[PDB]
């Protein structure tokens, strides 16, 4: 199917405790493959997946050079933005950057992304045309015409449509035993009596990749989203993911309910019932 590559940067200013902490993570779909922690001892981009370990030292040197150089720019921007809002030099502040590209099954450009945040809220983002900018407040418009005068959009678009997509293709093939595999969810149902007039049925979905999944409940073939509970999809710690959904049902009527599991690793959507 379609695939994504994302890079997440986070720079946290810590006044009185050194220079800002910079953390960079690289993702292909739902799989991290590189990371940079400026508080780690290597000061180099480190692999996080087996397939990227085969890249040569020229790869790891350029990746280390580029993102540490981004961390240096984040340091200056941290002081700049703090001045934009006239904020104290001892308060903590965070700059977050997200960017990446999407490709189709044929493996070429679908969409491109570039969004920047300050203190957890939108600052400036690259629009979908990859030629204009959308600013949240007036302080971010100062950055907008700065990036308009410097023509940052042209060179962001050049990477989003070029080097991003091209290397996403290489990663998808070099690690297809992991990235392009579709582990279907191993499912089951549990029953927990609440009282003697109500009971909880939980629909489990374990060990699936990618994380995208849909768990829904039905009663007599009719959708039931009242008295339901869905938890956030969570990592299992081994590359796969977990999720469950619950419904409170009257005692005796447990078999009127059905759980439905949709996932790209499944040929047909599964249906499970409590016997």
């Amino acid at each position: 199917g379609s695939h994504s590559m994302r890079y997440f940067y986070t720079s946290v200013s810590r006044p009185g405790r050194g220079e800002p902490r910079f953390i960079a993570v690289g993702y292909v779909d739902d799989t991290q493959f590189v990371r940079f922690d400026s508080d780690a001892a290597s000061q180099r981009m480190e692999p996080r997946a087996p397939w990227i370990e085969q890249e040569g030292p020229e790869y790891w040197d350029q990746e280390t050079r580029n993102v540490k150089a981004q961390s240096q720019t984040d340091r200056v921007d941290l002081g700049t933005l703090r001045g934009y809002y006239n904020q104290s030099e001892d308060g903590s502040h965070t700059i977050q950057i997200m960017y990446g590209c999407d490709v189709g099954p044929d493996g070429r450009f679908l969409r491109g992304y570039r969004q920047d945040a300050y203190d957890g809220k939108d600052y400036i983002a690259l629009n979908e045309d990859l030629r204009s900018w959308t600013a949240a407040d007036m302080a971010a418009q100062i950055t907008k015409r700065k990036w308009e005068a410097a023509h940052a959009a042209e060179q962001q678009r050049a990477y989003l449509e070029g080097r991003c997509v091209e290397w996403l293709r290489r990663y998808l093939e070099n690690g297809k035993e992991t990235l392009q595999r579709t582990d279907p969810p191993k499912t089951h149902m549990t029953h927990h009596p609440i009282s003697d007039h109500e009971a909880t049925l939980r629909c489990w979905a374990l060990g699936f990749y990618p994380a995208e999944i849909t768990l829904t409940w039905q009663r007599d073939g009719e959708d039931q989203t009242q008295d339901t509970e869905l938890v956030e999809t969570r990592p299992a710690g081994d590359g796969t993911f977990q999720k469950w959904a619950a419904v409170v049902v009257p005692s005796g009527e447990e078999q009127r309910y059905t759980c439905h599991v949709q996932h790209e690793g499944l040929p047909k959507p599964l249906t499970l019932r409590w016997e």
């Binding site: 890079y7 960079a24 690289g26 790869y59 350029q62 990746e63 580029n66 993102v67 150089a69 981004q70 720019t73 200056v76 921007d77 700049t80 933005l81 960017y99 920047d116 950055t143 700065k146 990036w147 410097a150 940052a152 060179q155 962001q156 050049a158 990477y159 080097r163 991003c164 290397w167």
Partner: peptide, 10 residues
């Protein structure tokens, strides 16, 4: 690979 385009200041 991460964006090789070099960062314009904010």
């Amino acid at each position: 690979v991460v964006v090789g385009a070099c960062g314009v200041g904010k």
